[PDB]
Amino acid sequence: NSTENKNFVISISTAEQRRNHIIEQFTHQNIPFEFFDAFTPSDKLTDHLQRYLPNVANAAQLTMGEKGCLMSHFMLWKKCIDENLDYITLFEDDILLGENANKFLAEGDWLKVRFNFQEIFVLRLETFLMPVQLEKQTQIPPFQQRDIDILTSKHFGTAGYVISQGAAKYLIALFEKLTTEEIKPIDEIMFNQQINATDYRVYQLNPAICVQELQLNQEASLLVSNLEQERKINLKYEK
Amino acid sequence: NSTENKNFVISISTAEQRRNHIIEQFTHQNIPFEFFDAFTPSDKLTDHLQRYLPNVANAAQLTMGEKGCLMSHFMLWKKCIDENLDYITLFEDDILLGENANKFLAEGDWLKVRFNFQEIFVLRLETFLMPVQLEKQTQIPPFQQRDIDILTSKHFGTAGYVISQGAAKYLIALFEKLTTEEIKPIDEIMFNQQINATDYRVYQLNPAICVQELQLNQEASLLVSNLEQ
């Protein structure tokens, strides 16, 4: 019911190259937006940390990079409340946009007609990328020409989504009700932790309307291998 | 160190078909192993549930099939502690092996030379299970020919991996510290939830050396055919 800016792209202030890449895209599809200076290990970060989320400042089970990332998202939720917005739409500076992205981002009526915004929902707009992937090892030596790659559980859906005001409130509180106890990074809570019960539901626009390209090429490269491996083992056992 | 049996294949006692399929493979590559009677919806299961993990018995957010599966894994962790094993190596009765499986399973020296076994690590030997995330119909109108599915439950393959004794302890405790609160199936914790935090590290042998029997047929079926709305 407002035309106050809802489209926010989290970006490190000096990330010149990315910001240009972003500007070209949003412009080209005639989509109004604003940047947001992403919190980095600094005075102004550490400030807001013990101010709003003390529990986190102590927690060394997170890199500062993840503390700075989580805050970026947190304050932008607080803004949805402050400006009393029905919903706000968050991105990171490393995305690519769909074809009819305008119809979803330029206007916001399709959204009004389909949802009650004080309900506690998120809508992922980013393609779904596997919440698991592997990194190459240096410490542990490859036996019989097979690496011991290390598994990670990053849930790359934080780079593009709508959050209801209801959901904004829910998340804001939920994060202040942690004391290093279940303190895991933002992705591993929003989409993962709370996907089992409580009234807070998560939707996935499908097909999606954006992507973190690099992750896709990697995810794809992994699951082509995984598949070819699987095929050769099935072929082996056929004797 | 020891040569006490480390290779355990979780299997439903009567699953004659599978057991034979298994025996042929482990034999053919000269790999010593033992079966383990997989818990089924029964007195003996429900017994051990409220005995060791009450929280779970209550939880109806899991099928009994998943309670029985989780238990199987749990006790086999407890055994790693009881027999004070450096590590134990668990499978389900539906796997297929690859060429040099013997070199990884017959012996366990390459393992000693590479890891400290009282640290918390798992090593997955299995390929990845598809699909990973399940999506559900939503009953909200598809805007610009794009439906708005609701996200459901993640699935990972628990059908083959090494677990350090340290890791055995970690997991054993971690599961007793749940009261239907974050009670999600075994896969959705071991590999997803807790690779996150607490210095618990998870490795993936790559290429893998095993795979769930029908994963290929299903993987192919996923790409070739999908559903309308």
Residue B146 near chain A (CB below 8 Å): yes
The answer to whether residue B186 is domain-embedded is yes
Tell me if B61 and A196 make a contact (CB, 8 A cut-off).
yes
- Phi, psi torsion values for A157, nearest 5 degrees: -135, 5
Query: CB neighbours of A194 closer than 8 A, spacing ≥ 6?
Result: A174, A200, A202
User: In terms of DSSP bridges, do strands A7-11 and A121-124 run parallel, antiparallel, or are they unpaired?
Assistant: unpaired
Instruction: Detail the DSSP E strand segments found in A34-146.
Output: 34-37, 87-92, 96-97, 121-124, 133-135
For tokens 């240009």, name the residue.
A20
The answer to whether residue B80 is domain-embedded is yes
| First-residue to last-residue Cα distance in chain A | 67
Looking at residue A78, its amino acid is: K
Query: Is A184 in contact with A67 (CB distance < 8 Å)?
Result: no
To test the contact with chain A by mutation, choose from B29, B112, B124, B133 the residue with the greatest count of A C-beta atoms within 10 A, namely B133
Q: Which residues of chain B lie closer than 8 angstroms to A146, CB-CB?
A: 205-207, 209
Neighbours of B112 (CB within 10 A): 13
Nearest to B196 among A148, A184, A229 (CB): A184
Give dist(CA B149, CA A73) in Å, integer: 24
Query: CB neighbours of A93 closer than 8 A, spacing ≥ 6?
Result: A9, A10, A11, A12, A15, A18, A19, A21, A22, A35, A38
Total domain count, chain B: 1
Query: Is B87 in contact with B111 (CB distance < 8 Å)?
Result: yes
- Phi, psi torsion values for A85, nearest 5 degrees: -85, 140
The answer to whether residue A74 is domain-embedded is yes
Give dist(CA A9, CA A94) in Å, integer: 9
The answer to whether residue A223 is domain-embedded is no
To test the contact with chain A by mutation, choose from B196, B209, B224, B229 the residue with the greatest count of A C-beta atoms within 10 A, namely B196
For tokens 């060791």, name the residue.
B52
User: In terms of DSSP bridges, do strands B87-92 and B160-164 run parallel, antiparallel, or are they unpaired?
Assistant: antiparallel
Query: Is A199 in contact with A114 (CB distance < 8 Å)?
Result: no
Give dist(CA B87, CA B108) in Å, integer: 10
Q: Which residues of chain B lie closer than 8 angstroms to A183, CB-CB?
A: 197
> CA angle, corner A170, sides to A165 and A175, nearest 5?
125
Looking at residue B104, its amino acid is: F
Cis amide prior to B131 (ω within 30 degrees): yes
Nearest partner of A7 among A65, A88, A74, A108, judged by Cα: A88
Mapped onto helix, strand or coil, the DSSP state of residue A97 is: strand
For B31, how many CA atoms within 13 A lie in the half-sphere containing its CB?
A: 25
- Phi, psi torsion values for A175, nearest 5 degrees: -80, -30
Q: Which B residues in the span 86-125 are in contact with A, Cβ-Cβ below 8 Å?
A: 96-100, 103-104, 110, 114-115, 123-124
The answer to whether residue B1 is domain-embedded is no
Looking at residue A76, its amino acid is: L
The distance of Cα A229 from the centroid of its chain, to the nearest Å, equals 30
Nearest to A203 among B138, B207, B215 (CB): B138
Query: CB neighbours of A146 closer than 8 A, spacing ≥ 6?
Result: B205, B206, B207, B209
The answer to whether residue A237 is domain-embedded is no
The answer to whether residue A125 is domain-embedded is yes
Query: Is A69 in contact with A93 (CB distance < 8 Å)?
Result: no
Q: Which residues of chain A lie closer than 8 angstroms to B25, CB-CB?
A: 237
Lay out the sheet containing A160-164: strands in order across: A34-37, A7-11, A87-92, A160-164, A121-124, A201-206, B147-154, B133-136
For tokens 């996935």, name the residue.
A204
Residue B139 burial (C-beta neighbours within 10 Å; 0-12, 13-18, 19+): exposed
Tell me if B144 and A185 make a contact (CB, 8 A cut-off).
no
Give dist(CA B229, CA B221) in Å, integer: 18
**Structure tokens belonging to residue A189:** 């809570």
- Phi, psi torsion values for A201, nearest 5 degrees: -110, 150
Query: CB neighbours of A144 closer than 8 A, spacing ≥ 6?
Result: B100, B103, B104, B110
Query: Is B229 in contact with B142 (CB distance < 8 Å)?
Result: yes
Residue A141 near chain B (CB below 8 Å): yes
Q: Which residues of chain A lie closer than 8 angstroms to B143, CB-CB?
A: 103-104, 110, 114
**DSSP one-letter code for B193:** G
**What's the Cα-to-Cα distance from A6 to each of A22, A88, A175, B118, rounded to whole Å?**
16, 5, 22, 51
User: In terms of DSSP bridges, do strands A133-135 and A210-211 run parallel, antiparallel, or are they unpaired?
Assistant: unpaired
User: Residue B28: which domain range?
Assistant: 7-224
Give dist(CA B13, CA B228) in Å, integer: 40
**Structure tokens belonging to residue A107:** 């206007």
Give dist(CA B180, CA A197) in Å, integer: 10
User: In terms of DSSP bridges, do strands B34-37 and B7-11 run parallel, antiparallel, or are they unpaired?
Assistant: parallel
Q: What is the DSSP string of A143-186?
A: BTTBEEEEEE-----SSEEEEEHHHHHHHHHHHHT-SSSS---S
> Does the annotation flag B182 for ligand binding?
no
Percent helix, strand, coil in chain B, to 5, is 40, 20, 40
Q: Which residues of chain A lie closer than 8 angstroms to B142, CB-CB?
A: none
> Does the annotation flag B93 for ligand binding?
yes
Give dist(CA A203, CA A73) in Å, integer: 18
d(CA B223, nearest CA chain A) in Å: 12
The answer to whether residue B51 is domain-embedded is yes
- Phi, psi torsion values for A199, nearest 5 degrees: -55, -25
To test the contact with chain A by mutation, choose from B129, B143, B158, B209 the residue with the greatest count of A C-beta atoms within 10 A, namely B143
Give dist(CA B197, CA A182) in Å, integer: 9
For tokens 């628990």, name the residue.
B158
Query: CB neighbours of A77 closer than 8 A, spacing ≥ 6?
Result: A88, A163, A168, A171, A172
User: In terms of DSSP bridges, do strands A147-152 and B121-124 run parallel, antiparallel, or are they unpaired?
Assistant: unpaired
Neighbours of A10 (CB within 10 A): 21
CATH number reported for the structural domain that contains residue B82 in this entry: 3.90.550
Nearest partner of A22 among A156, A210, A218, judged by Cα: A210
Q: Which element (helix H / strand E) includes B103?
A: helix B101-105
Nearest to A61 among B197, B202, B210 (CB): B197
